[PDB]
């Protein structure tokens, strides 16, 4: 049980390692924050007529 | 340079701090624009800089 548990935390350090998208939830919520203040900085160029 | 001015180069008023650039103007442009469409850099119309 004690090896069970050594090897599959082994699993997490190599999964984080190795896969880009593993924290996507994450990401997403920064990039959604970003992409608003971006579009919000875009919009002063807007003539509205 | 480096103070905080009531600028007008060519009738573009502004105020803001004047600074010596780096930015690579070719011949025929005399403003450049920041991402929120406000002017970020002027060529001097007595001191070509």
């Given at each position: 049980i004690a090896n069970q548990f050594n090897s599959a935390i082994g699993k997490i350090q190599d999964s984080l390692s190795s896969?880009?998208?593993?924290?996507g939830k994450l990401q997403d919520v920064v990039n959604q924050n970003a992409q608003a203040l971006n579009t919000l900085v875009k919009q002063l160029s807007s003539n509205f007529g | 340079k480096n103070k905080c001015v009531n600028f007008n180069f060519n009738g573009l008023t502004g105020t803001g701090v004047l600074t010596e650039s780096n930015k690579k103007f070719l011949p025929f442009q005399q403003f450049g624009r920041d991402?929120?469409?406000?002017?970020?850099a002027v060529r001097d119309p007595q001191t070509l800089e």
């Open positions: 896969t880009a998208s593993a924290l | 991402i929120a469409d406000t002017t970020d």
